[PDB]
Design a protein around this ligand. Structure first.
Ligand SMILES: O=C(O)[C@H]1NCC[C@@H]1O
Ligand SMILES: O=C(O)[C@H]1NCC[C@@H]1O
Lengths: 262, 262
């Protein structure tokens, strides 16, 4: 194992100003293939934790998979999440999202924090997601798309639908940011679909508004998304509506994987 | 009126090599607003020529609208189409396609020539379309997307659906290029979504494979598309299945608008 990875001051400034940031080539192909293979196994035996008719999402895999439980403690990831949240951290949510070639949905503009505040009891937006690129993310395979700086407009009052947590997981969403709001935000800030090669990591703020469109390429777009939360900002488990595999309840501070002979 | 517009040798080379080409800022805002206003009138009274539940397409407007009949003979357009097709030309098809803000469909990969050969009797791919930008075309408002150089692989054998011309106009298409074909083409050539400001013109070859995704922006994307065909390559009206407003039958060579006091 190396020195723990840190963002440079420039990277940090870029992250806070925009609310997202791509580090290119964090993992190699061999590491990425190990993650691809484990993701396929979870898609195949995830059960109620899966989302679809062909499988498209799985939730909570770091609680059940040894590979994924080590991934979240990796020295390429955990220290940056400590650095950005300025705290010890733990994993609130883990999920894999594949958009297969010539497939996919329009994911309505939204803020993760909005769901986590109302569904899970997250007190403050002191959280972020790391989306590992299992495939090259381009213009055409349905990249996550953001309003840069749009996290600074706090949580935005949103159109609310559904009952329970049934449509938290699906592309028609329970909390969709208004059309009139979006225009203002976008007139003001613009739109960015960060791109990069396989093995890249895209860090994004819990309150950044984001969306994506379908994949019109012949290449799949697999993403592993790890949502780190600050231990100080642990969710209020008394207001909690959802289960462990969507919203974690073990708030033990994580420590990084140590170098071992196995 | 000016000297007639021509592409530079570089532009022409770029067009033939890639099969598409954007000229920026061909029309001003005032010209574009005249076209917007006329398009709204056609969307409202086009009748059977319209396509939808909210209006999204209209076909054949240059046969019914004085503004649109002059547009096709404009010295910003007609001479480039002469230049690229190396012939006198006429309009085979005219259509307006709006993708409203937060709206739109995935348009499956396709080749226009494939439809025009089989539906209308077009002997050779000696045709092209000029798509005038009524709005700024960006990454996020569903730009027409192309395989550069993909016109040189001739007409590609395609999956065929429907009966009649019912699903020629709609986003699930009668002639959809295969998934396996596309991957090969794309592995080989890549993908480009030409962009530009309002009043731009995007010229593209009749055989270039193209597609688009929905508009996830708060801005509309209106396009006027004029399909010029070579007079020598006029359609065989004996194999013709569709009506005047989809496939024209007056093959008179066009001449440009002359400067008049009105
Ligand atoms: O509902 C959730 O918790 C997740 N799915 C969409 C928004 C979050 O990422
Ligand atoms: O069917 C047509 O003739 C037109 N619509 C889709 C392909 C062409 O542009």
């Amino acid at each position: 194992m190396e020195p723990h990875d840190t963002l440079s001051p420039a990277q940090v400034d870029e992250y806070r100003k925009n609310g997202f940031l791509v580090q290119e080539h964090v993992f190699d192909e061999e590491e990425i293939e190990l993650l691809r293979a484990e993701a396929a196994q979870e898609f195949a035996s995830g059960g109620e934790r899966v989302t679809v008719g062909i499988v498209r999402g799985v939730h909570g895999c770091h609680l059940y998979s040894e590979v994924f439980g080590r991934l979240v403690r990796s020295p390429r990831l955990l220290p940056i999440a400590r650095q950005l949240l300025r705290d010890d951290v733990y994993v609130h949510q883990f999920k894999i999202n594949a958009k297969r070639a010539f497939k996919g949905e329009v994911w309505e503009w939204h803020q993760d924090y909005t769901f986590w505040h109302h569904e899970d009891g997250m007190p403050a937006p002191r959280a972020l997601s790391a989306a590992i690129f299992l495939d090259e993310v381009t213009e055409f395979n349905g990249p996550l798309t953001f309003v840069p700086g749009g996290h600074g407009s706090g949580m935005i009052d949103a159109d609310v639908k559904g009952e329970g947590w049934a449509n938290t997981l699906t592309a028609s969403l329970k909390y969709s940011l208004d059309v009139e709001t979006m225009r203002g935000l976008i007139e003001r800030n613009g739109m960015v679909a960060p791109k990069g090669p396989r093995g890249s990591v895209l860090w994004f703020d819990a309150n950044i508004p984001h969306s994506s469109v379908p994949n019109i390429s012949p290449f799949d777009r697999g993403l592993v998304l790890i949502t780190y939360n600050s231990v100080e900002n642990k969710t209020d488990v008394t207001r909690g509506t959802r289960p462990e595999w969507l919203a974690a309840r073990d708030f033990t501070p994580l420590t990084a994987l140590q170098a071992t002979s196995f």
